[PDB]
Amino acid sequence: QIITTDNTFVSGNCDVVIGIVNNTVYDPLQPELDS
Amino acid sequence: QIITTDNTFVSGNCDVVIGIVNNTVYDPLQPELDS
Numbered sequence: 001q002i003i004t005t006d007n008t009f010v011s012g013n014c015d016v017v018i019g020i021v022n023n024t025v026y027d028p029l030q031p032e033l034d035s
Numbered sequence: 036q037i038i039t040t041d042n043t044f045v046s047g048n049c050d051v052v053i054g055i056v057n058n059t060v061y062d063p064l065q066p067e068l069d070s
Contacts, residue, residue: 032068 004028039063 001007004026014020036042039061049055
């Protein structure tokens with residue numbers, strides 16, 4: 001699946017989780033608000 | 036419980052699921068976008 005904010009949750013940050021990698025998480029709401 | 040977009044998910048289409056029917060899904064975001 002495309003990684004989106006609806007497929008993930010957030011807890012803590014990148015200075016805590018070992019093995020965390022850089023990525024982009026897509027927000028489907030943004031274009032709904034823009035249109 | 037009325038069928039809404041928060042009660043369903045999409046994977047594939049109507050040419051895939053045998054037994055799938057025409058129906059109406061309510062969008063809870065649309066009326067907010069409208070304001």
